[PDB]
Amino acid sequence: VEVLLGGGDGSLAFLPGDFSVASGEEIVFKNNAGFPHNVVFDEDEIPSGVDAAKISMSEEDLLNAPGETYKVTLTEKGTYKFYCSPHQGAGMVGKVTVN
């Protein structure tokens, strides 16, 4: 799945905003509109068997042109809220889940 950061430009959101995956699969986070963006897993709601610092981007690393991307192979069976830290309060939140 390629999670599209910038839902049609007219929705400051992902597409999808909720999805599920299997363990060992890869999520591709890519830009669409409204730049810049990033992906950050929420350190209070991720599963216990990981650290968001291995799956979020670095605090000053962001996707600033249209075609830029970030990628992660993900594991551990649980809920996965990742959001985009500039826009998470503005509503840009996604829910992956390894199931």
Residues in touch with Cu ion (CB under 5 A): 37, 84, 87, 92
Residues belonging to the binding site for Cu cation are 37, 84, 87, 92
- 84 annotated active-site: yes
Question: What SS3 state is found at 75?
Answer: coil
Check if the beta carbon of residue 98 is closer than 8 Å to that of residue 72.
Answer: no
Comparison of 3 and 84: residue with beta carbon closer to Cu ion = 84
Instruction: Please identify which of the residues 37, 38, 55, 63 carries the catalytic annotation.
Output: 37
- 92 annotated active-site: yes
List of E strands, 1-99 = 2-5, 26-31, 40-41, 69-73, 79-83, 93-97
- In angstroms, the CA 1 to CA 89 distance is 24
Residues belonging to the binding site are 37, 84, 87, 92
Comparison of 36 and 47: residue with beta carbon closer to Cu ion = 36
Comparison of 16 and 78: residue with beta carbon closer to Cu ion = 16
- 57 annotated active-site: no
- 4 annotated active-site: no
Tokens of 32: 């669409």
- In angstroms, the CA 5 to CA 28 distance is 10
Instruction: Write down the least CB distance from residue 54 to Cu ion, Å.
Output: 21
The residues carrying an active-site annotation are 37, 84, 87, 92
